[PDB]
Design a binder for these strands. Structure first.
Lengths: 164, 630, 372, 627
DNA sequence: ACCGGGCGTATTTTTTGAGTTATCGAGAT
DNA sequence: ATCTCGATAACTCAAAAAATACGCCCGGT
């Protein structure tokens, strides 16, 4: 009843759109164009739907790489390594929202789940006339997907202090 | 920490030859023999440059003319990392770098592109070493305990690399205590916390003491104050000596009276006094009316902001939900569950619920498309504003009448003066009693100061269980003991001289039975080299004996044989044998990169020492194929 | 029910600080400064009518009392038809004392008779004959004054539509104009009833009706400001806006209007606060559920305590006590530090769902107001 | 200041033997020949020990056991000084020595006894050199002795600078011996730095005490706003300082005709301030909530630190989506996603969880190796900001509570003058505390007087000019060092030399890049550089007068780098003779060397003898009864 | 009312001038 | 050494405009 506002601001539909754009940006940079593994989809909303972490995702150039994004957290002028460490914990806490995001992104022919526990993005032409906020969030998810794609699983999990 | 150099890599400037690799081994004395001609070893410049050295020390005329990306492979706790730095071109340095990571680096890119920058990799190395703390020892500052250029290894005076100036010397001097394990980052944090709490408690003690002083000095006048009160006619005649508690009781029950009247008879009431009382009653009425009216104006003013914020919240919810409509337009009536193969509408029903919520929010947004509520709100605000204006005008008129009455008459003037005195006294009592209650036996201030005192005492005690000097002394005891044990097997003029590492001097001190003397004065290449090796090996053995230590687990010994070789070879073997034992003494957690000229038979069959016909130095680490004369 | 429309319309157009009278000499009156009240009448005009002359010659003397109209008294006539006889035509054109006197001479000739005999008094029926005799026996100067500045009124032809038009002309919510005029006219009618049930000359003072208008406008505006703001009101309940469930609970408890405004502001601000925290990612779909369950448990405990303690007070008083106790209550939750209004707003949101209540029978009382 | 060696004397240990006499030439280049590595460096130790020393650095195995007493003969402005000294034997230092003051004496005592102590000898030498009894004569020995370990060594440039204390003292003494400052100005600078430290500390404490805790500042602000709302005090344009507000309130109290000018303006302004406070409370509450959340998460990670093992390593639960997925599965709905139960669904869900576990196993354990706590800087800043923001939020909240509760039933009579007087009573009771709090005049004046004495010391010292003199001195030093280097066969004379003080060394000039002496080898260049710079420094010293440094220099074996063989040493020695002769026979040079007699005899203006043997050879063979 | 055609228009895409930033060099500590 | 400041060049973003394909409007069935 109190939760209503949050359940509208962190609805699974937006999560599905974000995850779909993340996967779309991932295969767009992978060397072999392989689909990203499923346990990386749980690190999109905890990074994109958090405004300061998302701010760092936004401020880093698309060509600066995941490392340069994760290295901005500890900069003496910022000093927010705690957040780089909270990405994993926030992902732990937002498991249900991410899972419903994959739900709505698979059912809506946005992500086909390859039986090896992988996700291939389809085309499914873009949504119709969203607001600037949501379009920017989707673009950030695409950028983050590209970044995750450039690197291997081990490099990404190390750079984000994650434990799959 | 565990941090060893598995191999070096180079990328030719001309993209026609594959990158050249020089693979060391982990946990063994990696001997790089040969290189009769000695321009200078580039292994140390390459390793420091790839590790974030400020300026490029790589030979300009011989290597920078053919290498594009220098690189090393380092085995760490996180796993193998390939660290590469672009050749600085025509600059003292370039921040461009490439980094790769893996549990075991096997492949090597043929070409490299910028992947990170020097600052980021420096921070990565630091937090490998746990040196991202509150100004603090940095990774590069540890170059002292892992480098020994050809001069430093046998130089009787300089015992540590990067001790050639004031700033560097004092630097290393200030970092030694941290390395030895005395100053822990936890202790620095506790010290900073204690300082801040000291400042906070100082201010809080100042304020509490001032407030208690005010309370005490006022309470001293309590009896005179109560005499003044009974004089003013606010309390009955005190028949007998009173108690502070019941005196205060009288005072606050007096001040709490909603309408307190002076002790004056009404039978003989003048026209002026009756007029004064009537005006005062009108004043009370108007004041209450204006109080309620101000209440209403406050609530309206904040309700405007409330409506605006609710409008913004609804807009945000609509924005975050809108995509549900489109994501519904593309969802089939049912779908197959990704992870359980069930052809169910759960996704469809949830999209329907979200669309329902979007419909609700859309209805809320457009509930008053005709802006009637804003107009009604504005009209009501104008009503309240003009009503307050009228009330204030009425109050001003009342006060003007009252002042004219008091000015004209004199008995009314005296009455107003007396009631003003009474009210002023009551207000003074109110403020004083409020402060006295603020300084109660359990009030916020007393408890806060008490708990801050306890916190400061506890932090002081915590710092005092762990003494810096005792830790440093114990560390130096073990270091000197192990160094002497290493030295006795090694060849020195007398193998039974206890030694002491003077940190401030940054030098060994041989405590001989004849003279406790520095290494600087004993003139012999063999003894200088022996002491360097003994002290450094003991240092690193101690480091690896500790935990959460920030120094790399590797040591570069550049030309540990220049002292000989203007036979003596036997002595060299001793040295190397000792090194081997040291490396094998801790299950190969320590790696030694030994740039040397000692032929292979000196160390041919001594455990822990490895050497290959490859592993050249100077210019053969740059393949001649790349060499064309530039 | 037509005179009500006419009087309402003309009072809306009457000047400020005015006074008007009903069914005394004409169906409409207005007061300015002196004797000879100015009057306006409605005709279903007719040159001759027993009621007209009756009222005129009956309470012109009462109209002669001071503080009621300038001696050159204005006069008007609203007629629902363009019919008007020659004598009445001449009356309306009488804007000068001499012209009024000539018109009165014509009236005497046609109704009373030719001077000096005045024989037409017998020519008309006794009923109206005596009343015209009374009219013409008074001083002819008074006859001049009573018809010195006679006028006639002819609106758009639809009194209702004109009434709603003039009402909507003033600054008011157009969504409620109809109801406004309705209420206004009703009041007049009810007023008239009590003035004639007691058998007293019914008077509708322009300022009394004007204050009624102001009071009702403010009433509807305060009703509107306490709009829904949470769900779309049903069109059946849209005619008069029905405040949300929590506002209804407060009103059942009988809190002051300003306290209700504060409650609404807290509700909106808390809604925005939760929305913003979610949009920042600080909270989520489960960071609040602990808060709501704790709020409900503490409310239940407080309700039990209040029922055990304040039973002596009336139900509304107990509800006010529980309300203020809950809103004053503040428990520090997880390290989120909320502003002052957050907890009151959360209680209000819960109250909107009837899961948390103030009135010891807030469910029953809410059903009562639903059927009220 | 003129101080040269005229001769040496060596009392034998036994009585029958008589002292060995030694007589130098003043103002010339005294040369000593012999066999190096045979203890041929004992004369610098003997001179140092005779002139006092914290320890005896004379070889015990070759020399220091055949001589009861040591002696030194030094010519000086005051006159000839004969100093003695007793070897300790088993001990290391001796305070027993005999002194003799004279102008030019020829009597040579053969038996001595203690006549002076170390302190007296040192202080008489000091006031002979006119130092602050702070520099001392021993601190000048760095510019007199150049032993073998220092003669050709790219890293040590002066004698006995291999200790923190020694090199620091010599560092702080260059400013004086460089002839750019006086001892009085040295003491001035020292006391000035002390008062700078004290002033900075006390000004920091003053700024600490001056700032008021947020609670009392809020109380004063609320009381002032209350008075303003009543029309007493006019609306300020900007945020008033605490003192201004107290002053205006006190003025209001002192009045007698209290004309409450309550209007729409005052009430509206109070309400606007209320809404502004509400906005600021919202903002501060949001930011404080953020910071607090960060802090508790940091605390959780640090707790995991101790939870996981004996040492410090933080633990955070794994994603374990493979396990978490089945955690939500039950016997009612197999799929935790769609919420259904079915055997085929159950088995394929299982298969999916094993696939997920396989994927996680790729980088599973690798992410559990040494995850430390690097967020201590962040933790400290966040805790500081949490405390500060909590204080500020409580202040704003109390202020707003006052402004609101002053609209419910507290004002119900407040706008009445009878209650405005009560309010003024409250405020003029509180003004006492609000004057006590955060008001200090003793510490501000203490800081003011500290600053004033600092200004006086600055004016007296006249800083920013001493370093100019030092720059000129070092420029002259470099000029004449290059001049000398021209005379020395250096492999790159075209490269100048800079005496870099801040490191106690020389920074070799270079066009490719700045270079040091330790960077490159060529010990010949090392010795050339030391010779050039040391003679440059002595020339600059003697260029001025009353210079504390002596006017004699000792080089020990400045030819060991040559162990064609004669041209380089000949060049160096002729350059030394040139500099000495052009110095007008006031500078004395004592060069112990292994070069043959003729090698140094070829120089014009340099004198010596193939006598003078150092090491065990210096002891007459008759004294030598054995090892 | 439903299907199909033709015109209107909001959105996407393209474009573009302005603005923002990662990087580097030099400096300072 | 780390850190900062400033200069630089390249970048991306953001606004405006144009092209676009969609939705709305008009005519016929």
């Amino acid at each position: 009843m109190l939760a209503r506002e949050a359940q509208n601001i962190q609805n699974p539909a937006l999560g599905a759109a974000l995850v779909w754009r993340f996967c779309c940006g991932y295969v767009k940079t992978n060397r072999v164009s392989a689909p990203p593994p499923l346990p990386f989809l749980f690190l999109v909303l905890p990074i994109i739907l958090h405004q300061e972490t998302s701010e760092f995702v936004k401020r880093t150039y698309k060509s600066s790489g995941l490392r340069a994004f994760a290295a901005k957290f500890g900069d003496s002028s910022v000093s927010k390594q705690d957040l780089l460490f909270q990405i994993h914990e926030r992902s732990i806490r937002w498991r249900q929202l991410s899972l419903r995001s994959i739900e709505l992104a698979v059912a809506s022919d946005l992500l086909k789940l390859q039986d090896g526990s992988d996700v291939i993005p389809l085309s499914k032409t873009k949504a119709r006339g969203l607001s600037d906020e949501v379009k920017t969030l989707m673009d950030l998810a695409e950028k983050l997907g590209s970044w995750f794609g450039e690197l291997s699983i081990h490099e990404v999990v190390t750079t984000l202090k994650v434990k799959l | 920490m565990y941090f060893q150099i598995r191999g070096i890599i180079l990328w030719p400037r001309n993209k026609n030859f594959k990158p050249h690799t020089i693979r060391f081994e982990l946990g063994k004395v990696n001997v790089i023999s040969g290189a009769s001609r000695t321009g200078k070893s580039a292994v140390i410049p390459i390793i420091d440059y790839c590790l974030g050295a400020n300026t490029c020390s790589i030979p300009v005329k011989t290597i920078r003319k053919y290498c594009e990306w220098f690189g090393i492979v380092v085995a760490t706790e996180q796993g193998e990392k390939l660290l590469a730095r672009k050749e600085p071109g025509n600059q003292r340095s370039t921040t461009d770098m490439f980094v790769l990571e893996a549990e075991n680096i096997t492949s090597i890119p043929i070409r490299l592109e910028k992947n990170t920058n020097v600052i980021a990799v420096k921070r990565m190395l630091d937090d490998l070493a746990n040196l991202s703390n509150l100004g603090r020892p940095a990774f590069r500052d540890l170059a002292a305990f892992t480098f020994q250029p050809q001069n430093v290894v046998a130089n009787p005076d300089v015992l540590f690399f990067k001790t050639n100036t004031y700033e560097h010397r004092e630097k290393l001097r200030k970092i030694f205590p941290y390395v030895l394990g005395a100053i822990t980052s936890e202790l620095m944090a506790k010290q900073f916390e204690l300082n801040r709490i000291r400042l906070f408690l100082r201010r809080k003690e100042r304020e509490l003491k001032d407030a208690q002083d005010v309370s005490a000095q006022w309470l001293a006048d309590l009896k005179s104050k109560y005499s003044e009160a009974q004089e003013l006619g606010l309390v009955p005649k005190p028949q007998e000596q009173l108690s502070r508690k019941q005196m205060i009781s009288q005072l606050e029950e007096v001040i709490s009276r909603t309408d307190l009247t002076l002790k004056v008879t009404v039978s003989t009431i003048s026209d002026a006094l009756s007029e004064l009382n009537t005006l005062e009653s009108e004043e009370r009425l108007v004041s209450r009316e204006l109080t309620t009216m101000r209440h209403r104006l406050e609530e309206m003013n904040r309700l405007r902001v409330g409506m605006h914020q609710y409008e913004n919240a609804l807009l945000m919810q609509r924005d975050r939900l809108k995509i549900s409509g489109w994501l519904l337009s593309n969802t089939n009536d049912e779908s197959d569950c990704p992870m359980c193969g069930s052809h169910t509408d759960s996704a469809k029903q949830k999209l329907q619920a979200l669309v329902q919520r979007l419909s609700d929010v859309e209805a809320a947004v457009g509930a008053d498309a005709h802006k009637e509520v804003p107009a009604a709100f504005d009209r009501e605000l104008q009503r309240v504003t003009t009503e307050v204006a009228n009330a204030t005008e009425r109050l001003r008129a009342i006060q003007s009448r009252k002042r004219t009455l008091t000015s004209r008459s004199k008995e009314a003037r005296e009455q107003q003066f007396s009631t003003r005195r009474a009210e002023r006294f009551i207000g003074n009592v109110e403020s004083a009693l409020e402060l006295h209650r603020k300084l109660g036996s359990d009030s916020e201030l007393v408890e806060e100061v008490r708990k801050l005192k306890e916190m400061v005492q506890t932090l002081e005690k915590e710092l005092r269980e762990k003494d810096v000097e005792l830790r440093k002394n114990q560390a130096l005891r073990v270091i000197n003991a192990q160094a002497g044990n290493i030295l006795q097997g090694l060849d020195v003029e007398d193998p039974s001289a206890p030694i002491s590492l003077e940190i401030n001097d940054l030098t060994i001190k041989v405590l001989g039975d004849e003279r406790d003397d520095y290494l600087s004065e004993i003139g012999s290449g063999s003894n200088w080299l022996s002491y360097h090796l003994a002290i450094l090996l003991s240092l690193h053995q101690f480091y690896l004996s500790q935990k959460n230590n920030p120094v790399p687990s590797f040591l570069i010994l550049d030309q540990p044989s220049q002292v000989y070789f203007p036979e003596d070879v036997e002595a060299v073997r001793r040295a190397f044998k000792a090194m081997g034992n040291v490396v094998i003494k801790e299950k190969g957690k320590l790696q030694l990169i030994v740039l040397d000229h000692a032929p292979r038979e000196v160390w041919g069959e001594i455990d822990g020492v490895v050497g290959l016909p490859e592993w050249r130095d100077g210019i053969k680490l740059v393949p001649m194929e790349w060499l064309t004369g530039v | 029910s037509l005179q009500f429309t006419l009087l309402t319309h003309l009072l809306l157009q009457a000047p400020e600080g005015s006074l008007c009278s009903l069914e005394v000499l004409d169906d409409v009156a207005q007061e300015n400064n002196s004797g000879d009240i100015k009057f306006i009448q409605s005709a279903s005009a007719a040159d001759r009518a027993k009621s007209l002359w009756k009222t005129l010659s009956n309470w012109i003397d009462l109209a002669t009392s001071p503080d009621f109209e300038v001696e050159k008294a204005i006069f008007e006539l609203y007629v629902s038809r363009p019919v008007e006889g020659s004598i009445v035509k001449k009356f309306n054109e009488a804007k000068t004392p001499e012209d009024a006197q000539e018109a009165i001479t014509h009236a005497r000739t046609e109704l009373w008779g030719d001077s000096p005999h005045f024989t037409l008094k017998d020519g008309i029926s006794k009923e109206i004959s005596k009343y015209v005799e009374k009219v013409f026996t008074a001083d002819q100067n008074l006859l001049q004054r009573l018809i010195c500045n006679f006028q006639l009124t002819l609106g758009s032809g639809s009194p209702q539509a004109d009434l709603e038009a003039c009402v909507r002309s003033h600054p008011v919510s157009p969504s409620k104009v109809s109801d406004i005029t309705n209420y206004l006219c009703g009041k007049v009618k009810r007023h008239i009833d009590m003035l004639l049930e007691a058998e007293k000359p019914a008077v509708i003072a322009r300022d009394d009706f004007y204050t009624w208008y102001k009071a009702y406008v403010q009433k509807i505006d305060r009703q509107m400001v306490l709009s829904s703001r949470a769900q779309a009101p049903v069109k059946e309940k849209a005619q008069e806006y029905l405040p949300d469930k929590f506002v209804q609970q407060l009103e059942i408890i009988g809190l002051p209007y300003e306290e209700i405004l504060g409650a609404i502001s807290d509700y909106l601000m808390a809604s925005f606060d939760r929305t913003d925290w979610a949009a920042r990612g600080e909270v989520d779909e489960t960071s609040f559920d602990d808060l709501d369950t704790a709020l409900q448990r503490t409310w239940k405990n407080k309700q039990r305590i209040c029922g055990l303690t304040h039973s002596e007070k009336s139900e509304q008083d107990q509800g006010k006590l529980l309300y203020f106790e809950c809103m004053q209550f503040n428990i520090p939750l997880q390290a989120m530090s909320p502003p002052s209004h957050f907890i009151p707003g959360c209680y209000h949101i819960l109250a909107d769902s009837l899961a948390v209540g103030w009135h010891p029978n807030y469910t029953t009382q809410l059903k009562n107001k639903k059927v009220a």
